[PDB]
Amino acid sequence: DMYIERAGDITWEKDAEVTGNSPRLDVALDESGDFSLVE
Amino acid sequence: GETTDGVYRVMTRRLLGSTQVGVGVMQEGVFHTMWHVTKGAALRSGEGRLDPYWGDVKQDLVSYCGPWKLDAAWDGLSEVQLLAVPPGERAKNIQTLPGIFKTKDGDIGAVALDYPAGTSGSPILDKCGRVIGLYGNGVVIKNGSYVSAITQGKR
Numbered sequence: 001d002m003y004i005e006r007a008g009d010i011t012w013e014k015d016a017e018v019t020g021n022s023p024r025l026d027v028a029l030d031e032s033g034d035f036s037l038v039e
Numbered sequence: 040g041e042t043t044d045g046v047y048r049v050m051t052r053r054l055l056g057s058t059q060v061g062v063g064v065m066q067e068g069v070f071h072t073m074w075h076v077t078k079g080a081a082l083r084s085g086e087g088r089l090d091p092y093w094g095d096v097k098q099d100l101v102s103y104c105g106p107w108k109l110d111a112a113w114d115g116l117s118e119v120q121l122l123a124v125p126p127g128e129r130a131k132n133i134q135t136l137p138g139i140f141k142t143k144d145g146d147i148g149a150v151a152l153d154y155p156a157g158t159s160g161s162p163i164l165d166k167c168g169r170v171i172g173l174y175g176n177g178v179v180i181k182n183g184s185y186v187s188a189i190t191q192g193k194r
């Protein structure tokens with residue numbers, strides 16, 4: 001069986017660490033909910 | 040069980056010790072997570088039970104105790120925050136400018152951040168703290184890096 005445990009409030013943090021890029025990708029979504037790259 | 044709004048870890052004792060299989064959002068009395076985290080199974084919250092109410096494998100989403108309540112959307116321009124809840128580690132906010140997944144059926148925001156699989160279900164928020172989707176369903180791109188869709192339901 002699965003159980004849940006609280007981990008925190010949902011709030012925006014002022015001055016949080018800023019990272020990650022912003023790629024623009026062509027993708028396909030199948031019936032199983034899997035994303036794949038289209039080339 | 041605990042009904043307080045917030046972010047929650049989804050745990051199991053089926054495997055070795057106590058394992059974090061994912062994360063979810065409690066909002067307006069409804070628990071929201073990704074389908075691949077629970078596979079639609081019932082959940083325990085203290086001595087209480089949370090039963091599935093709605094779910095869809097293709098969207099990779101599930102809600103418990105009521106219908107999907109999260110309806111905020113990324114504005115297509117601004118930075119957002121992943122409120123990452125990794126296994127055995129404190130909740131941490133990461134700010135990022137989303138990229139885009141372009142599909143035959145329209146565009147969706149995407150975040151290029153890599154966390155353990157048990158981080159799936161962590162909420163992505165806008166500047167007002169509204170949940171614009173959940174992290175954890177995405178793809179491995181050319182250079183081997185992970186990019187998650189910003190997955191949002193329909194209210």
Ligand SMILES: Nc1nnc(-c2cccs2)[nH]1
Pocket residue numbers: 153154155156157158159174175176179185
């Ligand atoms: N190949 C790979 N790298 N990161 C991942 C995931 C992160 C959150 C859910 S799956 N999967």
